[PDB]
């Protein structure tokens, strides 16, 4: 009756537009936590190799799968840091296309649907431009001292983000059948 | 063998007087976490709509049930913040009667039984009066900017608190039988 | 060279009244009500707040301003980061928050930090999320309630009103402090 | 107006010796041993503590006091919240903590913040939980152990003894610093 | 499919030399959390009775058992605090022999294998001497105000630590068979 | 006695240039770029950093030093604990970090706190873990990138080079500030 956060937590009734999101990393963290797929526990993947910190809460969507064999990642904008392992309701407001070490790794940019400040945003264009620059720079830089290259491209609108999410929902459901 | 914190964690040998308490919210937090009953995970219910913070650690008693269909809530006084999802041993020292949006929602005021500073308190009357005022004001105010009203009444002695706990223990055991 | 009294010896700045130096007294998230000690220029604990509330933003005063209550003009400064009490920064007014505290007028400026890349581009409080304004209003209405003190907060007024209030404080300081 | 040396230029306050201004040097929870630099009035890092220990409460000194060790009288201030080094607050003595540090006497006041709603009503250290007193004693016994320095802490003495010690420091300051 | 952190999390392929470590206590904490063996949850065992804090992250090795019937404890040196309940990969660099209330209770001193600063240490002798003194003093003192005595002896080299770990791995496997 | 301007009125210390007083402006882990206001001696917010980066260590300046850019000599101080802006500590140089910021030279000292038991025993930057040096270099290369400002950081130079740079700043201060 205790849930594995990727398999057992539901994506939520309003998916793909509104979805449960499991936080892995807190805003301001230098610790890169990640879900351990096997156990469903949080593990330290690494300490970041630069004096950088995550600009926002970061995690993944339960019952999603991508071509890299992991759930779909999400950056969640909100007033407050959230603890790793806790889940929240998020609305997608953009897609951030990236290439990490030659491999495609697009990520959702979302807001917390239960944050009174942020829940009213629907589109990444409504954010201050500096914010977007800060996010882009973070992803370009956070693995630089590991001699890894991350290319970050122009963000794409919510309708693209939501298609990405629906596609990962499909890929997950297709993986669950075989098992 | 991994526990759901409401169903699988025992209430403890000394219940109802002394009980295990699962912390949901840390002292000083603006994040209102709560137990997700289905999964047993911690979720963000909301960010508080006012510039207020929880005055003390806050959570629930495992294997308890109230008329609102949730476990019985507890405010736990102690020297240190405790992380959401962690449990501790608590002694009830009072009952705080409230009405939230017309619905009865009484809460226990407790101390941590393993805090050397606080474990020796047996009654809410032993606390400084200002503390009680601060607690009362918090519950009156924390949902005000959501246009919700919470009436908070005079606190009741430990013997009342312990009856409330025993009653929730009964209501839980009665719910578990049907299933 | 001389170490500065932050009220008297810190300049208000070239862009005033529009953009001005601001001395932080209280950090965002604080339950400690620090204030300028006018005699020494040190920061003092006035009180610990009597409720489980915290300052929603950094808060301080404008140097070389005076109000009828004998104090510099108060400012709430929105920006990404907490700032330490006693440090100063450059701020731009985006509104005025009219209040009455224990029957006395006590208007406060709402501003943004002019050197924060995120917030320096705001010019008007109406550009902020509505919730933000509600949180700020509620704070000032609630923060002295458990001291049985009443604060009424009225609708916020535009930047041109803010700027006029700042200019007036500047004149009252010159009249009462600097020139006699 | 003049910016203040916090030892010399900050007044001890109208209620002294009972209630007095206190300058915080070290914040509750800190492993950094800050101290007043007597020459400049700035705060300096004296050392990082040599053990995994932290100050149990805010700690500082009383302005315009002097002890035989050539320093102001030290004070441990109990209250709800951490206070920043360099800020001052109003405190009430509730006891005296007699100690010997490397063979020299070094009594310290134990006090509460007079403007903290929770703690301002305490008048005597015996009103605190026994554990609190044990933690404080252990801290002072342990905090220099890894520097091979010995501190013996004796049983705490009542407020009337505290107040007498404060009055004496006030007199020694007037004698040695103010009047010559 | 959700893991009990002692039973269900693997010790890791490189054990005993490199092992998964479940953090119980964060660097800087006055809260002594510990694993609840029954549930696999984190619980508050006590608030420390002195004004002391853990000098480093602290936890236990999954699928290990000692003569005191608990998993083997580990102090993990790294740049950053880690949250209770999260696991990480650690390399043993020493054994710290202790006697707690007359009972033998040796503990591993390790580094995080994924911390770029610390992963390159192989031996406790490579640490500044003051660090070792600080650690030793912490264990000698942290239970003093509870009138408990902890004797801490000279640290022993990595090869001893690794034998201790292998032995606890054996004791665990021998306990698992009966069940 | 006089309250001190931290650049002018704080002594560099008896052990200089080897060991020197250092005034912290920015705390380890901070995204706020504080700096000394040379006119007042107060700490001011220069900017909030334009990237999601943080200072890797405590950072400040040496009192009674001058560089061609009209500012005291900058210092990065390694130690166990964050230190508050405006406080001073004793530091030992272990290297020099040569940089060019927007085409202008801007060498900075790398040092350790002389009163931190862990770090006071280091004498040379080569004794630090290689990763530590890479993190520091990357910080200075990256921290102004989103302001479209370029900083090139070159290989670090030994303590004897650091010490010479400090001595030179001391002489330039005496020449330009103290003696005229």
UniProtKB/TrEMBL annotation, chains A, B, E:
Keywords: Hydrolase, Magnesium, Metal-binding. It is an enzyme of class 3 (hydrolase). The keyword Lipoprotein does not apply. Its cofactor is Mg(2+). It catalyses: diphosphate + H2O = 2 phosphate + H(+). GO terms for molecular function: inorganic diphosphate phosphatase activity; magnesium ion binding. GO terms for cellular component: cytosol; nucleoplasm. Its EC number is 3.6.1.1. GO terms for biological process: phosphate-containing compound metabolic process. Belongs to the PPase family. This is inorganic diphosphatase. It comes from Medicago truncatula (Barrel medic). The chain holds residues 76 to 254 of 257 of the full protein.
């Amino acid at each position: 009756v205790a849930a594995h956060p990727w398999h057992d937590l539901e994506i939520g009734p309003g998916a793909p537009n509104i979805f449960n999101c499991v936080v892995e990393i807190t805003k301001g963290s230098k610790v890169k936590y990640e879900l351990d797929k096997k156990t469903g526990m949080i593990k330290v993947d690494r300490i970041l190799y630069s004096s950088v910190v995550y600009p926002h809460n970061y995690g993944f969507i339960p019952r999603t799968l991508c071509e890299d064999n992991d759930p779909l990642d999400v950056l969640v904008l909100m007033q407050e840091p959230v603890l790793p392992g806790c889940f929240l309701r998020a609305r997608a407001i953009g897609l951030m296309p990236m290439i990490d070490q030659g491999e495609k790794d697009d990520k959702i940019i979302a807001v917390c649907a239960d944050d009174p400040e942020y829940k009213h945003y629907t589109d990444f264009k409504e954010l201050q431009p500096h914010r977007l620059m800060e996010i882009k720079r973070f992803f370009e830089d956070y693995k630089k001292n590991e001699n890894k290259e991350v290319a970050v491209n122009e963000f794409l609108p919510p309708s693209t983000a939501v298609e990405a999410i629906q596609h990962s929902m499909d890929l997950y459901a297709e993986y669950i059948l075989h098992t």
